[model samples]
Target: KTFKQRRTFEQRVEDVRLIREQHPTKIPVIIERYKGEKQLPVLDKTKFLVPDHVNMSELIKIIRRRLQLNANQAFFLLVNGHSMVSVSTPISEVYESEKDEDGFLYMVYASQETF
Candidate 1:
């Protein structure tokens, strides 16, 4: 028989409750504590040279912790100008230093609920 035909309102509610109880609990995502300090690059105005000292992975970890994101959520940022070129370089390559403009990089992160 169909569910609607076989069950009363109270019976349906009870069934829902039972089903909910049987479902596994979902664990929230957590960011581990920072292990060490990350040294950032410095900008010199005279030569207009910026060093590449940004740790993308470490930054991601910190962002996740600060925002308290869930497992499905994530955060992202954009490094512009010469700084981006330096930061994007492969770890194997020699570090190249450049100068950055007087502006902050763009940062974006996700939230559990709609804004």
Candidate 2:
């Protein structure tokens, strides 16, 4: 067992710091598509894993091109209900700030009606 020794009065003032000097945290991204539809190649899944350095904009472009979406078509990504996220935004910051209690960031993508 990891023994918990009796603490002295001096131990009350503990110096604890979280060092993120290790590898980047792996984040989970869930992408939703309509039912009965399918992807072109191998990217047919509701969930994916990406490093903290992944960009939101790059991911959008990749998904759009992979699906062969036309110019007139547009997809809006609502991250935790915030659509103002930029393309160059890092996944780590987003995950840390807005992820759920379970440490998973949610992004909802959908097509537009008017534009």
Candidate 3:
């Protein structure tokens, strides 16, 4: 099940609150594959605690390594499923604007080659 589906909104919000208390500078991120994605396999893990200063390109690189994707693979990450973020944008900026009601930033990753 998707992380959100597995927990109630209050539960998720509480979890985020506790996690932020423990790591105030880190962002709790939930990265998932796009529902229609086929070419890229599911990530090994969906949950991440990322430093506030990391930019989108760095995050993309991390995910690309996890998937062992090549330069031609053409990976893209969409915030909350629809908006595309700039590669150079700091994640904290994105987090501040795009974080969900449960206080977690949700990102969907996909490869355009999927057909």
Candidate 4:
């Protein structure tokens, strides 16, 4: 199920409000597995609070570590279910452009077998 389905619009808005107020420099990110994800395992959790200055590469590393992926494995993040962002792009920059209406930056990760 999507994160939006789990929480009401008002609830997410208020959650983001407090989260931003309490940690002004951090961004609330919602990371989920793509429904058709084949090679990658599901993430342990969906919510991550990341520093605004962090880039996409760093975030990908975080997810990779959680999944315990090996060097041969490959994966990419799908931003807002539409496109990918450059590794050099800061989280805040992407967030500004693609944040959901409820104030969370949503991303889905997917991968395929290399063989």
lDDT to native, each model: 0.32, 0.55, 0.86, 0.85
Candidate 2 backbone overlaps, count: 0
Give candidate 2's TM-score: 0.59
How high is the lDDT of residue 88 in model 2? 82
User: Model 1 scores what on Cα lDDT?
Assistant: 0.32
lDDT (C-alpha) at residue 13 in model 2 = 22
User: Per-residue alpha-carbon lDDT of model 1 for 8-109, expressed as tens digits?
Assistant: 757655543453456323111112222221322111211111223434455555455555556765333333211233334532122222211221122223
Question: Clashing pairs in model 2?
Answer: none
* Error at 54, model 2, angstroms: 1.9
Poorest 10 consecutive residues of model 2 by lDDT?
12-21
Candidate 1: pairs in clash: 49-98, 49-99, 50-98, 50-99
TM-score of 3: 0.90
**CA lDDT, candidate 4, residue 50:** 90
All candidates: TM-score: 0.30, 0.59, 0.90, 0.90
Task: Encode model 3's per-residue lDDT on 18-109: one tens digit a residue.
Answer: 88889999999999988888788898887889999999889889889989998888787887767554779998998988899889999887
Better candidate number, 2 or 3, judged by TM-score: 3
Cα lDDT of model 2 overall?
A: 0.55
lDDT string, candidate 4, 6-115, tens digits: 99999999999998989899999989988887777887788889999989999888888889999979887878877564888999899999999989988888774221
